[PDB]
């Protein structure tokens, strides 16, 4: 198996060093929206 | 005289007009600077990771 005669390993291993940290991120998010409507008006007493 | 209270009336309602355009700009301003603070200490914070 490769070892020496008092067992130590005779070969270096690696790991392939996992992927840096993550970055994660918000946004603003709009919806459609609308505006009111007019109905008829009515006729007061007074002048303009 | 009458034209005169008249068109004083309609300028003060432009002057309230700017007033509030100038407070409006200077608050999203403001917000904006805030914005801008925060993404830069996300980036330091990943470094500091």
Do not use: C
Request: hydrophobic residues 40%; negative net charge; without cysteine.
């Amino acid at each position: 198996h490769n070892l020496s005669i008092d067992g130590q390993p005779l070969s270096l291993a690696i790991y392939a060093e996992p992927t840096d940290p993550k970055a994660l991120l918000t946004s603003m998010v709009q919806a459609s929206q609308g505006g009111s409507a007019v109905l008829p008006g009515t006729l007061s007493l007074y002048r303009f | 005289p009458v034209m005169l209270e008249r068109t004083r009336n309609l300028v003060a309602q432009l002057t309230q007009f700017g007033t509030s355009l100038l407070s409006m700009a200077e608050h999203d301003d403001a917000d904006e600077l805030t914005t801008l603070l925060l993404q830069q200490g996300m980036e330091l914070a990943t470094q500091s990771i």
